[PDB]
Amino acid sequence: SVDMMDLPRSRINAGMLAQFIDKPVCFVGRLEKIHPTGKMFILSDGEGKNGTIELMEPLDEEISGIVEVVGRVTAKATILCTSYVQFKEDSHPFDLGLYNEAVKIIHDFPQFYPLGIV
Amino acid sequence: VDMMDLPRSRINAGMLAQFIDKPVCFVGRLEKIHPTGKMFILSDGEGKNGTIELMEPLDEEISGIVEVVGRVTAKATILCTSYVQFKEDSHPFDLGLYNEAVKIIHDFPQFYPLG
Amino acid sequence: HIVPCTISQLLSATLVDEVFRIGNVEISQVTIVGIIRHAEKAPTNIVYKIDDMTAAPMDVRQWVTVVPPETYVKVAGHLRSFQNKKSLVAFKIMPLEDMNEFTTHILEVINAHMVLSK
Amino acid sequence: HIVPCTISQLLSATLVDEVFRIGNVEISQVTIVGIIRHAEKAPTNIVYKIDDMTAAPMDVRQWVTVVPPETYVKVAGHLRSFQNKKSLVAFKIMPLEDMNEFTTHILEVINAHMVLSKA
Known about the structure:
The complex is a heterotetramer, with 2 copies of chain A and 2 copies of chain C. By secondary structure, chain A is mostly beta strands. Chain A has a single domain, classed as CATH 2.40.50.140. In chain A, 11% of the residues lie in helices and 34% in strands. Chain A contains 1 helix and 6 strands; from the N terminus they run E-E-E-E-E-E-H. In chain A, strands 2-3-4-6-5 form a 5-stranded mixed barrel. By secondary structure, chain C is an alpha+beta fold. Chain C has a single domain (1-118), classed as CATH 2.40.50.140. Chain C has helices at residues 7-11, 100-116, and strands spanning 3-4, 14-16, 19-22, 25-27, 29-41, 45-51, 58-63, 72-82, 85-95. Chain C has a 5-stranded mixed β-barrel with strand order 5-6-7-9-8. In chain C, strands 2-3-4 form a 3-stranded antiparallel sheet, with no helix packed on it. In chain C, a hairpin with a 6-residue loop joins strand 6 and strand 7. Chain A binds chain D through residues 5-11, 26, 66, 70, 85, 87-89, 91-92, 94-95, 98-99, 102, 105-106, 109, 111-118, and chain D through 6, 8-9, 11-12, 35, 37, 51, 53-57, 70, 72, 96-100, 103, 106-107, 109-111, 113-114, 117.
């Protein structure tokens, strides 16, 4: 498939998933649960709403805490994950609520936080 | 009775139903004047209409961008207590941008407090 | 720096140690945008009642021309309190020529306070 | 001063007579925050590929300990261009200890560019 790392990816929350079907996204949330197959997991955003993350292959490590997923929103309004990283929280807890307000700001003031070229 | 003494919420037509009996400030483009001159229609920044009922008939024509202060009625119209035409002689008023500001106001109540 | 505010925000400022704060945001020099409801030319000063719709009109004073009522103006000045009654001592009261500057002020308030709040 | 930017904003800059602008505003010194996707080490310098999600990752050269990929950093540097490809030359590359500084940068970007848009 196309390389998503070379496209703009929109920072969204779970309430935006339905509006972003088939779009490259970046979803930051708290790990809530990993499916027994290790091929799916749930993240909750800074509003406490859940998003479902799917993988093509099983997780090869135990993830926890705040996780940032990049992928494409599927027809089901899940995210097909092409990559992810766990946010470092060993010196400061990540304020996911503040992050949510920043996501809202990004979308309300798009002229000042452009998605891709101009 | 004196509404100048309470907060009036800046809204667009889509919020009228959610603000029944509340003091509001509605900015929009003059679309139509009722033949009695005792009511007019404003269109907001997303092309939706709000109906403005006046207590007294208009004296002069009004046109262009109008800011109405009033209370929302049970019919989701506005009973107007005052209105002013926005000056636009130097620069055209961008009603679409204004509508964006109304959405933002309501998205961030903590940073634009009513009371 | 100078901070864009609403009158509701100024009215809600706390005074403690002679620093004013709107939330955690310390403020002194501020701007507001409003319509002149009442203009009072006294021999020793002008006093304006300025209304931004977010609360009752606020007292804005200049020490001694007078701006007519129903005029949207931009105001720059300093927050003053006496017996917990707030008021504005203004070094600038400028009628708006471009009404878009009024819309812009709303955006500026919300943005400044977002970024300043922490 | 030093302007906080997104990579998308940097890409959008026009270059006219040795001068970059976003609008009518000269920019040279900037900060970005992003994740390292790649690091290419040479004796005298490192080139990082840094991704802030706003666009494709941008090259950032630091003149010389390499920051490991998948690390979030703040970069202070100057915008440069060659054959119409923009990149940064960094005087600071700082891994973030507190991930809230990443969130804060988003807000600083938006505020800075609002303010500059009126000037």
